[PDB]
Symmetry: D2
Subunit: 115 residues, 4 copies
């Protein structure tokens, strides 16, 4: 699993379940091409987006559909979505965790890059 997404809810103090997540790769013409997607699990985690073979160096975007999350909870949010854009680079045997902590008008995201 070279790429995992983990989302927490700062209002409820819980994993953010069933949040849709879309990952894109930047193509040679500078467009974003769909790469991988899924819905966070009960643990707020999304595993199995990609494989080491397909996850080559390049620029990726991870879009977390925060607006739908909040709306399903009856809560008015600010952002359309949260976007995390980064370059994946093969300097070493790397796993990338993209973590996000959500509030209705604020979010933070952090990258945990290990081995």
């Amino acid at each position: 699993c070279p790429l995992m997404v983990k989302v927490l809810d700062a209002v409820r103090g819980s994993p953010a379940i069933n949040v849709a997540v879309h990952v894109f790769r930047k193509a040679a013409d500078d467009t974003w091409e769909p790469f991988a997607s899924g819905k966070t699990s009960e643990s707020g985690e999304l595993h199995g987006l990609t494989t080491e073979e397909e996850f080559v160096e390049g620029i990726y975007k991870v879009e977390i559909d925060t607006k739908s999350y909040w709306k399903a909870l009856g809560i008015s949010p600010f952002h359309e979505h949260a976007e995390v854009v980064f370059t994946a680079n093969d300097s070493g045997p790397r796993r990338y965790t993209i973590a996000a902590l959500l509030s209705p008008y604020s979010y933070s995201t952090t990258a945990v890059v290990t081995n």
Copy 2:
């Protein structure tokens, strides 16, 4: 001043100065068109992006060029930029402050919206 951007540096404990910010507005054809741009001042704030006349309802994207920021300081950061996307003025004119706090592998953004 219906739209202001404020950026702080969590490593230095200081305003993040000379950060480039580009704003875009989703067009009729579903494309991101350029709307305004600027750079943060010595206080980390960016004022004068737009006017209340110009700042009509729409979906806006505020792209904060954090990578250029960290690179100019000898740090190779994780993200390309921080993107903040939101619907604005959908219940009449409001004043928006988009704040961001930056670390090399992590950022948070919050919106303060006043009437």
Copy 3:
């Protein structure tokens, strides 16, 4: 104004108003003695806590009464308060802004320190 405190509410996207703040300074006998207190204003800011004469070197603790804040709004939050502890003025006088962003199960705090 060598010490200012600013608090925002990540659920509302607004300044966090009427937040009580107590400041303490570690004494010669290793005890937390009362130093100053106040409440955030309509802009979420707390000014006038101390003076440059009074604000000598020391270890200070800024206790932000987030539980009282959230309770007055029908929310049962996780934390009792947010505590910010730091050495101040150890290389001469500085001006400190202690900022905090609050959600019911989460908070962040940052310091901006200027000369």
Copy 4:
């Protein structure tokens, strides 16, 4: 494991290893009595602080020794430590994760309370 601590480093994008963590329980005389302690592992996690039998309702403080962490990395930090203070309450079969994300002049903490 009713109480687990997880610490991340926002500057390096990694777990924060070998951070000392001290947990206290508030006694009837309002003093903090040592309760449990340890050092975060290679995964930035600290498991096995306590047991369900000993972790009764009450007010606890978790102190994360952030200053020593940063100093061991050659980095000048702002806070003496990060403190997280909360009431543990038996409304349900609960596991408490106290997470913290560290930067030299900023930290965030979140509580993830599950089952």
